[PDB]
Structure formats: structure tokens, C-alpha cells
Short mmCIF file of C-alpha atoms and ligand atoms in Angstrom, two decimals:
data_model
loop_
_atom_site.label_atom_id
_atom_site.label_comp_id
_atom_site.label_asym_id
_atom_site.label_seq_id
_atom_site.Cartn_x
_atom_site.Cartn_y
_atom_site.Cartn_z
CA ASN A 5 110.31 72.13 79.65
CA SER A 6 113.22 74.45 78.89
CA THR A 7 116.98 74.04 79.07
CA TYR A 8 119.39 76.20 81.13
CA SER A 9 123.09 76.94 80.86
CA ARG A 10 126.22 76.76 82.94
CA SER A 11 126.30 80.38 81.85
CA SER A 12 122.98 80.86 83.72
CA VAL A 13 124.32 79.15 86.87
CA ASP A 14 127.51 81.27 87.00
CA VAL A 15 125.57 84.56 86.78
CA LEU A 16 122.97 83.45 89.30
CA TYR A 17 125.68 82.38 91.71
CA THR A 18 127.86 85.43 91.21
CA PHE A 19 124.83 87.65 91.88
CA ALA A 20 124.21 85.76 95.13
CA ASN A 21 127.84 85.87 96.28
CA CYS A 22 128.42 89.56 95.32
CA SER A 23 125.11 90.38 97.10
CA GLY A 24 126.16 88.59 100.31
CA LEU A 25 123.54 85.91 99.86
CA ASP A 26 123.37 82.12 100.55
CA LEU A 27 121.74 80.74 97.46
CA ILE A 28 119.42 77.75 97.61
CA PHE A 29 118.71 76.03 94.32
CA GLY A 30 115.57 74.00 93.62
CA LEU A 31 116.03 70.83 91.54
CA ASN A 32 113.68 69.22 88.96
CA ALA A 33 111.54 66.57 90.64
CA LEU A 34 109.55 65.53 87.55
CA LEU A 35 112.45 63.73 85.85
CA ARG A 36 111.56 60.14 86.54
CA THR A 37 112.79 56.56 86.22
CA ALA A 38 110.39 54.33 84.28
CA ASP A 39 108.82 52.95 87.50
CA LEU A 40 108.07 56.53 88.76
CA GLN A 41 111.37 56.71 90.71
CA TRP A 42 113.38 60.00 90.53
CA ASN A 43 116.22 59.87 88.02
CA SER A 44 119.19 61.69 89.49
CA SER A 45 121.27 62.17 86.30
CA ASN A 46 120.54 65.81 85.43
CA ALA A 47 121.14 67.02 88.98
CA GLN A 48 124.24 64.78 89.17
CA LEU A 49 125.57 66.69 86.15
CA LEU A 50 124.63 70.01 87.70
CA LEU A 51 126.08 68.97 91.06
CA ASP A 52 129.40 68.03 89.41
CA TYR A 53 129.74 71.37 87.57
CA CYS A 54 129.01 73.24 90.81
CA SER A 55 131.50 70.92 92.53
CA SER A 56 133.86 71.65 89.65
CA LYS A 57 133.40 75.41 90.22
CA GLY A 58 133.73 75.44 94.04
CA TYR A 59 130.28 77.03 94.54
CA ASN A 60 128.87 76.84 98.02
CA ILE A 61 125.16 76.35 97.32
CA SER A 62 122.18 74.71 99.07
CA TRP A 63 119.43 72.61 97.54
CA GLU A 64 115.75 71.86 97.27
CA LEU A 65 114.02 69.15 95.26
CA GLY A 66 110.60 69.75 93.71
CA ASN A 67 108.05 72.53 94.06
CA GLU A 68 104.43 72.24 95.09
CA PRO A 69 104.56 68.42 94.72
CA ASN A 70 100.95 68.35 95.95
CA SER A 71 100.20 69.75 92.47
CA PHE A 72 102.21 67.53 90.05
CA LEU A 73 99.02 65.82 88.81
CA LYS A 74 97.16 68.99 87.76
CA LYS A 75 100.53 70.46 86.86
CA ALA A 76 101.98 67.46 84.92
CA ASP A 77 99.59 64.53 85.21
CA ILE A 78 102.15 62.61 87.33
CA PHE A 79 101.14 61.79 90.95
CA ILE A 80 103.97 61.35 93.49
CA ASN A 81 103.01 60.34 97.04
CA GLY A 82 105.13 61.79 99.84
CA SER A 83 106.75 58.44 100.69
CA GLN A 84 108.02 58.33 97.19
CA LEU A 85 109.23 61.86 97.39
CA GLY A 86 110.71 60.95 100.74
CA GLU A 87 112.79 58.19 99.14
CA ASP A 88 113.76 60.59 96.41
CA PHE A 89 114.97 63.09 99.03
CA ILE A 90 117.06 60.34 100.64
CA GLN A 91 118.69 59.81 97.24
CA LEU A 92 119.44 63.49 96.82
CA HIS A 93 120.93 63.41 100.29
CA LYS A 94 123.22 60.46 99.33
CA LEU A 95 124.56 62.52 96.42
CA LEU A 96 125.41 65.75 98.31
CA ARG A 97 127.28 63.86 101.04
CA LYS A 98 129.33 62.03 98.43
CA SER A 99 130.24 65.41 96.83
CA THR A 100 132.66 68.24 97.73
CA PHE A 101 131.33 70.05 100.77
CA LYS A 102 128.72 67.51 101.96
CA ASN A 103 128.18 69.63 105.11
CA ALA A 104 125.89 71.58 102.75
CA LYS A 105 122.14 71.89 103.37
CA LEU A 106 118.92 70.43 101.94
CA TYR A 107 115.30 71.67 102.47
CA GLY A 108 111.86 70.58 101.35
CA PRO A 109 109.33 69.65 100.30
CA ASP A 110 107.88 73.10 99.31
CA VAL A 111 104.24 71.95 99.40
CA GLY A 112 101.53 74.61 99.18
CA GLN A 113 99.67 75.70 102.33
CA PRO A 114 97.45 73.65 104.68
CA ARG A 115 94.88 72.14 102.64
CA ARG A 116 93.14 69.08 103.80
CA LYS A 117 94.82 67.22 100.82
CA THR A 118 98.27 68.83 101.34
CA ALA A 119 98.64 67.80 105.01
CA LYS A 120 98.47 64.09 104.08
CA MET A 121 101.32 64.54 101.59
CA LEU A 122 103.54 66.47 103.99
CA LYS A 123 102.96 63.98 106.84
CA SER A 124 103.85 61.02 104.62
CA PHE A 125 106.88 62.89 103.37
CA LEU A 126 108.13 63.76 106.90
CA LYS A 127 107.81 60.08 107.94
CA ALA A 128 109.96 58.87 105.02
CA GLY A 129 112.19 61.90 104.32
CA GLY A 130 111.98 63.92 107.60
CA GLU A 131 115.41 62.56 108.47
CA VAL A 132 117.51 64.25 105.75
CA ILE A 133 116.05 67.79 105.69
CA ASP A 134 117.60 70.72 107.62
CA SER A 135 114.30 72.65 107.59
CA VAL A 136 110.69 72.16 106.52
CA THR A 137 109.42 74.36 103.70
CA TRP A 138 105.88 75.41 102.89
CA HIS A 139 104.23 78.18 100.88
CA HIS A 140 101.50 80.66 101.74
CA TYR A 141 99.50 83.36 99.82
CA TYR A 142 96.55 85.37 101.18
CA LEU A 143 94.55 85.98 98.01
CA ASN A 144 94.08 85.08 94.35
CA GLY A 145 95.53 88.11 92.59
CA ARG A 146 93.06 88.15 89.75
CA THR A 147 90.15 88.70 92.12
CA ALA A 148 91.90 90.25 95.20
CA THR A 149 90.48 93.76 96.18
CA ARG A 150 91.81 96.77 98.04
CA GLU A 151 89.69 96.17 101.19
CA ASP A 152 91.10 92.65 101.50
CA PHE A 153 94.56 94.21 102.00
CA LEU A 154 93.02 96.21 104.85
CA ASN A 155 90.91 93.42 106.34
CA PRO A 156 92.21 92.04 109.61
CA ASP A 157 90.18 88.88 109.03
CA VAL A 158 92.27 88.27 105.94
CA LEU A 159 95.45 88.73 107.94
CA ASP A 160 94.33 86.26 110.68
CA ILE A 161 93.56 83.28 108.39
CA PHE A 162 97.40 82.99 108.22
CA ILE A 163 97.43 81.76 111.86
CA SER A 164 95.41 78.59 111.19
CA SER A 165 97.63 77.79 108.28
CA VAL A 166 100.50 78.07 110.68
CA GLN A 167 98.84 76.10 113.54
CA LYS A 168 98.00 73.33 110.95
CA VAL A 169 101.62 73.06 109.74
CA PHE A 170 103.08 72.70 113.25
CA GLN A 171 100.27 70.25 113.88
CA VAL A 172 101.69 68.07 111.12
CA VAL A 173 105.37 68.66 111.97
CA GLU A 174 104.92 67.92 115.70
CA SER A 175 103.24 64.60 114.78
CA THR A 176 106.47 63.57 112.88
CA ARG A 177 109.64 65.66 113.40
CA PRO A 178 109.51 67.81 116.48
CA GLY A 179 112.55 70.06 117.00
CA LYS A 180 112.70 70.29 113.25
CA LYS A 181 112.94 73.86 112.04
CA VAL A 182 110.10 75.30 109.87
CA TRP A 183 110.53 77.81 107.03
CA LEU A 184 108.07 79.77 104.92
CA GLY A 185 109.67 78.63 101.61
CA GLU A 186 107.78 80.78 99.06
CA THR A 187 105.24 83.32 100.22
CA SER A 188 103.32 86.48 99.36
CA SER A 189 100.08 88.48 99.21
CA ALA A 190 98.30 87.13 96.17
CA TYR A 191 98.92 84.21 93.86
CA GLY A 192 98.92 84.32 90.11
CA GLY A 193 101.79 86.79 89.91
CA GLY A 194 100.17 89.27 92.41
CA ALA A 195 97.21 91.66 92.55
CA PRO A 196 97.73 94.43 90.02
CA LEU A 197 98.20 97.90 91.55
CA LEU A 198 97.92 96.39 95.07
CA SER A 199 100.72 93.85 95.56
CA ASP A 200 103.28 96.48 94.65
CA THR A 201 102.06 99.28 96.88
CA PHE A 202 102.20 100.72 100.42
CA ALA A 203 98.97 98.74 101.05
CA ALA A 204 100.93 95.46 100.46
CA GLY A 205 102.89 96.32 103.65
CA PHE A 206 100.04 95.51 106.01
CA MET A 207 100.25 91.91 104.84
CA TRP A 208 103.94 91.55 104.61
CA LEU A 209 104.78 93.09 108.05
CA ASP A 210 102.00 91.08 109.71
CA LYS A 211 103.30 87.94 108.05
CA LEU A 212 106.75 88.59 109.59
CA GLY A 213 105.10 89.48 112.91
CA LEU A 214 102.99 86.30 113.10
CA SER A 215 105.79 84.00 111.77
CA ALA A 216 108.35 85.18 114.31
CA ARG A 217 105.91 84.92 117.16
CA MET A 218 104.81 81.40 116.04
CA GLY A 219 108.24 79.75 115.50
CA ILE A 220 108.96 80.29 111.85
CA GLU A 221 112.75 80.73 111.67
CA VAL A 222 112.91 82.06 108.07
CA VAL A 223 110.42 83.72 105.71
CA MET A 224 111.26 83.80 102.01
CA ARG A 225 109.51 86.58 100.03
CA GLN A 226 108.14 85.98 96.55
CA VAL A 227 109.87 87.91 94.98
CA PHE A 228 112.89 90.19 95.11
CA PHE A 229 112.88 91.07 91.45
CA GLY A 230 110.48 90.02 88.65
CA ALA A 231 107.31 89.93 86.55
CA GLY A 232 104.90 89.60 89.44
CA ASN A 233 103.40 92.68 91.07
CA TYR A 234 104.64 91.27 94.41
CA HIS A 235 108.27 92.19 93.65
CA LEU A 236 110.31 94.18 96.16
CA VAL A 237 112.07 95.90 93.23
CA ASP A 238 110.22 96.91 90.06
CA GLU A 239 110.82 96.58 86.30
CA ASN A 240 113.29 99.54 86.23
CA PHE A 241 115.12 98.33 89.38
CA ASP A 242 113.24 100.76 91.61
CA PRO A 243 112.63 99.79 95.27
CA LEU A 244 108.97 99.40 96.17
CA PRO A 245 107.54 100.21 99.63
CA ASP A 246 107.88 96.62 100.73
CA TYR A 247 111.63 96.87 99.93
CA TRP A 248 111.99 99.90 102.19
CA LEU A 249 109.90 98.17 104.90
CA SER A 250 112.05 95.05 104.55
CA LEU A 251 115.31 97.03 105.00
CA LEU A 252 114.04 98.75 108.04
CA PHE A 253 113.02 95.44 109.50
CA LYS A 254 116.43 93.86 109.03
CA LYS A 255 118.24 96.78 110.54
CA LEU A 256 115.87 97.21 113.52
CA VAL A 257 114.29 93.87 114.55
CA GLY A 258 116.32 91.18 116.39
CA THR A 259 116.47 87.40 116.39
CA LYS A 260 115.04 87.08 119.94
CA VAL A 261 111.27 87.13 119.79
CA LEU A 262 109.01 88.45 122.55
CA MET A 263 105.37 89.40 122.80
CA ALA A 264 103.15 92.44 123.03
CA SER A 265 99.35 92.60 123.15
CA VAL A 266 96.64 95.27 123.52
CA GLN A 267 94.70 95.66 126.79
CA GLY A 268 91.56 96.63 124.80
CA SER A 269 91.48 93.16 123.14
CA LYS A 270 88.40 93.21 120.87
CA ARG A 271 88.92 94.83 117.50
CA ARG A 272 91.33 92.93 115.30
CA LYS A 273 92.77 96.11 113.73
CA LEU A 274 95.64 97.04 116.08
CA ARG A 275 98.43 94.44 115.68
CA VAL A 276 101.58 94.58 117.75
CA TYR A 277 104.83 92.65 117.88
CA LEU A 278 107.93 92.70 120.08
CA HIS A 279 111.54 91.55 119.65
CA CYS A 280 114.90 92.36 121.17
CA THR A 281 116.52 95.18 119.30
CA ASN A 282 118.85 93.96 116.54
CA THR A 283 122.15 94.53 118.45
CA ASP A 284 124.19 94.78 115.28
CA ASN A 285 122.70 98.26 114.61
CA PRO A 286 125.45 100.75 115.67
CA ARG A 287 122.88 103.08 117.35
CA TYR A 288 121.76 100.66 120.04
CA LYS A 289 122.92 98.50 122.91
CA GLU A 290 121.74 95.08 124.02
CA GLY A 291 118.70 95.10 126.31
CA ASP A 292 116.82 97.54 124.06
CA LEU A 293 113.46 96.41 122.62
CA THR A 294 112.02 96.77 119.04
CA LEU A 295 108.25 97.21 118.77
CA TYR A 296 106.38 97.10 115.50
CA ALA A 297 102.80 97.92 115.02
CA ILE A 298 100.11 98.10 112.32
CA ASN A 299 97.00 100.28 112.53
CA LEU A 300 94.00 99.27 110.51
CA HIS A 301 91.67 101.81 112.12
CA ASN A 302 90.38 104.74 110.11
CA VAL A 303 91.68 107.13 112.79
CA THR A 304 94.93 107.72 114.74
CA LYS A 305 95.62 105.54 117.79
CA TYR A 306 98.06 106.42 120.62
CA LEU A 307 99.83 103.53 122.41
CA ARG A 308 101.04 103.71 126.00
CA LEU A 309 104.22 101.85 126.92
CA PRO A 310 103.73 99.86 130.14
CA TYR A 311 105.54 100.07 133.51
CA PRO A 312 108.40 100.09 133.97
CA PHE A 313 108.94 101.31 130.37
CA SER A 314 106.46 104.21 130.54
CA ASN A 315 109.22 106.84 130.99
CA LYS A 316 111.92 105.71 128.44
CA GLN A 317 113.22 107.52 125.25
CA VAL A 318 111.90 106.11 122.00
CA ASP A 319 113.05 106.32 118.38
CA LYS A 320 110.08 106.14 116.09
CA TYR A 321 110.20 104.94 112.56
CA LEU A 322 106.79 105.73 111.02
CA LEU A 323 105.99 104.82 107.40
CA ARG A 324 103.18 106.43 105.38
CA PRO A 325 102.45 106.67 101.66
CA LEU A 326 103.85 109.38 99.40
CA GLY A 327 100.85 110.94 97.67
CA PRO A 328 98.91 111.62 95.62
CA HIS A 329 97.75 107.94 95.35
CA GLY A 330 97.97 107.26 99.09
CA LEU A 331 97.65 103.56 99.90
CA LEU A 332 97.95 102.51 96.21
CA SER A 333 101.16 104.54 96.05
CA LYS A 334 104.51 103.06 95.07
CA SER A 335 106.48 105.64 97.10
CA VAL A 336 106.73 105.81 100.86
CA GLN A 337 108.06 108.30 103.40
CA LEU A 338 109.75 107.67 106.76
CA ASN A 339 108.90 110.17 109.52
CA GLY A 340 107.76 112.56 106.71
CA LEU A 341 110.87 112.10 104.49
CA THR A 342 110.50 110.37 101.09
CA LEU A 343 112.80 107.34 100.86
CA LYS A 344 114.94 107.04 97.73
CA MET A 345 118.32 105.70 96.68
CA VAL A 346 121.11 108.29 96.81
CA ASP A 347 122.42 106.75 93.60
CA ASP A 348 122.74 103.21 92.11
CA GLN A 349 125.48 102.08 94.58
CA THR A 350 124.26 103.84 97.73
CA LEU A 351 121.34 103.66 100.12
CA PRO A 352 120.35 106.69 102.23
CA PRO A 353 120.23 106.83 105.98
CA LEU A 354 117.01 105.69 107.57
CA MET A 355 116.61 108.37 110.13
CA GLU A 356 114.57 108.09 113.25
CA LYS A 357 112.68 110.71 115.15
CA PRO A 358 113.92 110.69 118.75
CA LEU A 359 110.67 110.88 120.66
CA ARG A 360 110.03 112.52 123.91
CA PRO A 361 110.67 110.28 127.01
CA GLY A 362 107.26 109.31 128.44
CA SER A 363 105.29 110.42 125.36
CA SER A 364 102.67 107.97 124.12
CA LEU A 365 103.22 106.45 120.68
CA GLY A 366 101.18 108.08 117.90
CA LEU A 367 100.17 105.62 115.19
CA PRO A 368 97.99 107.12 112.47
CA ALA A 369 95.21 105.49 110.47
CA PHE A 370 96.39 102.80 107.98
CA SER A 371 100.02 103.08 108.94
CA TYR A 372 102.81 100.85 110.21
CA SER A 373 105.71 101.97 112.45
CA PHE A 374 108.71 100.69 114.47
CA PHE A 375 109.67 101.95 117.94
CA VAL A 376 112.95 101.10 119.55
CA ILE A 377 112.86 101.41 123.33
CA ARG A 378 116.26 102.93 124.13
CA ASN A 379 117.72 102.05 127.55
CA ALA A 380 115.20 99.21 128.11
CA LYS A 381 117.74 96.97 129.94
CA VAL A 382 115.83 93.70 129.42
CA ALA A 383 117.88 90.62 130.46
CA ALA A 384 116.71 88.16 127.75
CA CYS A 385 117.90 90.62 125.16
CA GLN B 1 88.50 106.04 122.49
CA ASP B 2 91.94 106.27 120.89
CA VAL B 3 94.32 105.43 123.71
CA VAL B 4 95.31 101.78 123.97
CA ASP B 5 97.56 100.34 126.64
CA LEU B 6 99.99 97.55 125.73
CA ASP B 7 101.07 94.40 127.63
CA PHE B 8 104.70 93.11 127.03
CA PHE B 9 106.44 89.77 127.70
CA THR B 10 110.14 90.32 128.36
CA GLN B 11 111.17 87.50 130.79
CA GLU B 12 112.88 85.24 128.26
CA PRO B 13 112.93 84.98 124.45
CA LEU B 14 109.96 82.99 123.16
CA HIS B 15 111.56 82.22 119.78
CA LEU B 16 114.93 82.55 118.17
CA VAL B 17 114.80 83.26 114.39
CA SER B 18 117.64 83.22 111.88
CA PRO B 19 119.65 86.35 111.25
CA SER B 20 118.42 85.50 107.71
CA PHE B 21 114.73 85.52 108.85
CA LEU B 22 113.66 87.95 106.13
CA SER B 23 114.73 86.22 102.88
CA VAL B 24 113.68 86.36 99.23
CA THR B 25 113.13 84.24 96.13
CA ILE B 26 113.81 84.51 92.42
CA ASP B 27 111.12 82.60 90.48
CA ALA B 28 112.42 79.82 88.26
CA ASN B 29 110.37 81.30 85.38
CA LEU B 30 112.87 84.22 85.29
CA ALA B 31 115.16 81.75 83.52
CA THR B 32 112.63 81.62 80.62
CA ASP B 33 113.28 85.38 80.10
CA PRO B 34 115.89 86.27 77.39
CA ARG B 35 117.15 89.13 79.64
CA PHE B 36 118.27 86.97 82.64
CA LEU B 37 121.95 87.72 81.92
CA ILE B 38 121.31 91.50 81.89
CA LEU B 39 119.02 91.78 84.88
CA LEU B 40 121.16 89.94 87.45
CA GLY B 41 124.29 91.79 86.22
CA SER B 42 122.67 95.12 87.12
CA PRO B 43 124.87 96.85 89.76
CA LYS B 44 121.83 98.79 91.08
CA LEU B 45 119.92 95.52 91.77
CA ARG B 46 123.04 94.03 93.46
CA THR B 47 123.20 97.08 95.68
CA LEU B 48 119.60 96.55 96.80
CA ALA B 49 120.27 92.83 97.46
CA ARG B 50 123.28 93.68 99.62
CA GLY B 51 121.10 95.91 101.80
CA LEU B 52 119.14 92.75 102.50
CA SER B 53 122.15 90.65 103.60
CA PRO B 54 122.34 88.42 105.43
CA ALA B 55 119.60 86.36 103.76
CA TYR B 56 118.76 83.27 101.73
CA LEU B 57 117.98 83.60 98.05
CA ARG B 58 115.72 80.80 96.89
CA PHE B 59 115.78 79.99 93.20
CA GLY B 60 112.79 77.86 92.44
CA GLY B 61 109.13 78.09 91.61
CA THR B 62 106.63 76.23 89.52
CA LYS B 63 109.24 76.21 86.75
CA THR B 64 111.71 74.18 88.98
CA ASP B 65 110.20 70.97 87.55
CA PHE B 66 110.79 72.10 83.93
CA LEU B 67 114.38 73.25 83.80
CA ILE B 68 116.77 70.73 82.24
CA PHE B 69 120.47 71.27 82.71
CA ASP B 70 122.25 71.00 79.37
CA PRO B 71 126.06 70.95 79.56
CA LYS B 72 126.38 71.90 75.86
CA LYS B 73 124.62 75.29 76.30
CA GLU B 74 126.00 78.74 77.11
O1 IVO C 401 101.18 82.26 91.29
C1 IVO C 401 102.05 82.87 91.97
O2 IVO C 401 101.98 84.10 92.33
C2 IVO C 401 103.22 82.05 92.39
C3 IVO C 401 103.85 81.40 91.17
O3 IVO C 401 104.29 82.46 90.31
C4 IVO C 401 104.93 80.43 91.66
O4 IVO C 401 105.76 79.98 90.58
C5 IVO C 401 104.31 79.21 92.37
O5 IVO C 401 105.28 78.39 93.06
C6 IVO C 401 103.25 79.72 93.30
N1 IVO C 401 102.63 79.02 94.27
C7 IVO C 401 101.73 79.86 94.85
C8 IVO C 401 101.83 81.09 94.25
N2 IVO C 401 102.77 80.97 93.31
#
């Protein structure tokens, strides 16, 4: 255990608010009443200060509760945690906003043990939560290799984790919204010289692809800044290729999710995803489509847009490594232009290449790219 | 051969995600660092975080169950 300060809270909040971010704060679940019931006193204090300060903040309780026993030699069944969540819910409603949110229970991924705990928790506590949170990592960082990052079989395991979660949630709280609460490439602080590279982007972009297509409403990346190799921003506050990928995604990809698929249909290496174009982007209209694609082949592939889209004008946003280290590189170029900050207060333009109208979509070996179909005029979008 | 044709489904939206879909976390262990004050005050880092708005910032992690609020600490 360690103690933290009001000083810590103020900074953490201010950083969220000045960054245009809704902070969610996880609370300590291992503080316990003699009978193994959750003592609410520390949070109560913290809630009051935050009430005192007028901070609009959202809350979680516990982390990886499936692991308390190995992690602290205290076993809490879900029911118990469910009661505990009800108590937390009592407290937030009594306090200043009370139209403020609560999520949980942040259990690790579908494990045959972890499903039991989540099910029992959603029976008891499914009622108070505004979203369901789980975690996912692909590999153990200490033993993760470079081929893994390029292995479509590794990517696809993610799907059964997802199917298994919705299997549990539909049994208890259908219509309840599901969130990837903490997630990444490799656990144990990341795979060294892999989790912080261009190669990490095959996993991250596919994770966002699969999640959007399978009903995950929010995906929370471990981490933005920190010790772990899986940071979006490094030790010296430099953006890593995942940060540049993540920017591009937010600016280009919409909330309305669609579907694309390959007519070939055998090899697992050409992954494609389709959303409405993020309307907010000043370059586009509504009705335009945003296609993102990963190529895990060791040669270039050229995609053909289908009727009646075969003859439309397309902006291409191709990402490839900045050498000499290639896929293990920590710099990345967009359409052949290295991406860097202009200075410490200013991001550069992300510039497209307007493609030819009717041209097929070149996607080179081990690359990922976005393509915005301009003048698509789709009605759902 | 290197030409692949794609199928699309554009009739209606299959899922609706949050404008905050792509979100991030700060690990609770970052509060065991002595440089917490300095790192989050960085204007460069805040700039990067603003390019990711709108989004949720989740402060938690394994260390969530080992932080004790102390009112007499600053
Ligand atoms: O070990 C990690 O990389 C992180 C670890 O650093 C986090 O604190 C913990 O919540 C976790 N669960 C799965 C992975 N992780």
C-alpha cells in the first residue's frame, strides 16, 4: 500500500480537464470491513473532497478482482463485489452531481474462472453500472516475439474473448453497454522493442476494428504515458507510432459501424473494416465512408472498391515505418512524409493523397492504411 | 494473385460506438513515481492528450487496490 494526496488528485484532474478529457477514477476495493464487507470510509473522504472541489469525475471500484487472492490473499466472490458496487452507487447518488457514472468490474479476459465471477457480479451488481468493463492483452511481454505481432492467428484469438464476454453479458444484462476497460498488446508492462513500435499497430488497429464491428462502444488503451513499452507517448514525451495511428483514427473513423470483407476469403492476413466517415472532419460530408485495412502479406495487395463505388475519388492515408529499423521503428511516415510535432503546442496536418477516381487501392506488405470514399452518398451515414 | 475484391455492407449502421471510442488509461502505479507532479504538468503531453479528445481517461490499474487517500498529505 501507498498513500496519495489531494495534491495528486488536483493535478490529475486538471490534466484531464485541460486536455478535454472525462476522467474515470478507480477506487480501492481491498479495504474491507471485518466480515469481508467493503469499508467505504476512504472513498467517502475522497468523494467529499472532490465534491468540495466541484470536480466532475466518474468512478470504478476494484481492478482485476478475479485476482485478489493471488494478488492479496483475499477472495471476493462477485455477489459480494456486487453488493459493494450497490454501496458505492448509494454514495454517489447522495453526493453533489449524482447523475455521474459508475463502471465495473474490470475483470481480466475470458478465462473459464473469470466468467463465473463476472456472471455472479452482473446478477447482483448489473443494475448500478453504466457499462461493463473487461481487460484484454494478446501476449506475455517477457516472452512475446516479433512474428507474434505479425501473426493473424494471434489477432483472431481476440474474437473468442469477445464472443465469450457477450455470452456472459447476454445471459444477465442485455442492452447493457460493454467497454474494453484496460487493454493492450502484451502484459507485464509490454514487449520490449515491440510494444512501442510500428509493428504494435497491427494489433492496436485490429483491436479497434474487431471491437467496433462486435459492439464494443469504448476501448481504453493501456497506456497514454508511462513505464510500459505499450505507451502512446514515450519517456521524453515523444509520440510513438500508435499515437499517430490513434490520432488518424479519431479524425477519420466515425461512430456508425459498417462491414467490409474480402471476396478471396481464405488467408487470414488481409483485414478490412468499414465505418461512416467521421462527419466532424472539415474535409468531408455525411454519406462518405471510411475504410481501414491491414496487410500481413509479404507482398503488396491491391483492393478493388465494389459497385457502385468502383468509380469514386479516394483520399488515402497510408502508414509505413521510418527506417532504418523498419517494423521495429519508433518513427512512422504518412503517404511518404515523416510525422512529427511542429513544436510542443502544435500538431502538424495529416495530409492525404487524393487518389485517382476508379484506381484500385494499393496496400503494401506489412502496412496499414485508411481510405475515405469521397462522395459515397450512403444513407445510413 | 495480388488483386482482391471487397464486399461492403452499407444498408444501415450495425453498431454505434461512442465519440470517445478510442480512449486511454494512466496506470495507478504512476502515482508511486516521485515525478507524477512534473509529468502531468508537461504542456507537451497535454497537447498530445488534447489531440485525442474527446475521450475517457481511466486512472486505475493493479495499484488501484493499494492507494490510500490521506487528507493530511500534499
Ligand atoms: O501487466 C501489464 O502490462 C498490465 C499491468 O501493468 C496493469 O497494472 C494490470 O491491470 C494488467 N492487467 C493485465 C495487464 N496489466
